[PDB]
């Protein structure tokens, strides 16, 4: 399982910052982004 920590605001804005480990999905909170591995 892989995870990505990125500074994001608003769920809809986590999509772009999640582009790190090559994962998908966004959803960010408290200036943190989460990526769901497939």
From Swiss-Prot:
- Give one GO term, molecular function aspect: ion channel inhibitor activity
What keywords are assigned to this protein? Disulfide bond, Ion channel impairing toxin, Neurotoxin, Potassium channel impairing toxin, Secreted, Toxin, Voltage-gated potassium channel impairing toxin
Report the domain of life of the source organism: Eukaryota
Principal location listed in the UniProt entry: secreted
Asked if the keyword Secreted belongs to this entry, the reply reads yes
InterPro entries reported for this sequence: Scorpion_toxin-like_sf (IPR036574), Scorpion_toxinS_K_inh (IPR001947)
Q: List the disulfide bonds.
A: 8-28, 14-33, 18-35
Cellular component GO terms held in the UniProt record: extracellular region
Summary of the tissues where the protein is detected: Expressed by the venom gland.
Q: Where is this region: Interaction with Ca(2+)-activated K(+) channels?
A: 26-33
Q: Coiled-coil segments, which residues?
A: none
Q: Where in the cell is it found?
A: Secreted
Per the similarity annotation, which family is this? Belongs to the short scorpion toxin superfamily. Potassium channel inhibitor family. Alpha-KTx 03 subfamily.
Q: What is the documented function of this protein?
A: Potent inhibitor voltage-gated potassium channels Kv1.3/KCNA3 (Kd=0.65 nM) and Kv1.1/KCNA1 (Kd=41 nM). It appears to block channel activity by a simple bimolecular inhibition process. Induces a transient period of fast flickering in the channel openings, followed by an almost complete blockade of the channel. Its binding affinity to rat brain synaptosomes is 5-fold higher than this of KTX-3. Binding of the toxin to the channel is associated with significant structural rearrangements in both molecules.
**What more does the entry say?**
Negative results: shows weak inhibition of large conductance calcium-activated potassium channels (KCa1.1/KCNMA1) (Ki=1560 nM). Shows weak or no inhibition on Kv1.2/KCNA2. Shows no effect on Kv1.5/KCNA5 and Kv3.1/KCNC1.
Q: What is known of its domains?
A: Has the structural arrangement of an alpha-helix connected to a beta-sheet by disulfide bonds (CSalpha/beta).
According to UniProt, the name of this protein is: Potassium channel toxin alpha-KTx 3.1
Natural source organism:
Androctonus mauritanicus mauritanicus (Scorpion)
């Amino acid at each position: 399982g892989v995870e990505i920590n990125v500074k994001c605001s608003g769920s809809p804005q986590c999509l772009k910052p999640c582009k790190d480990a090559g994962m998908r999905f966004g959803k960010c909170m408290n200036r943190k982004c989460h990526c769901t591995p497939k």
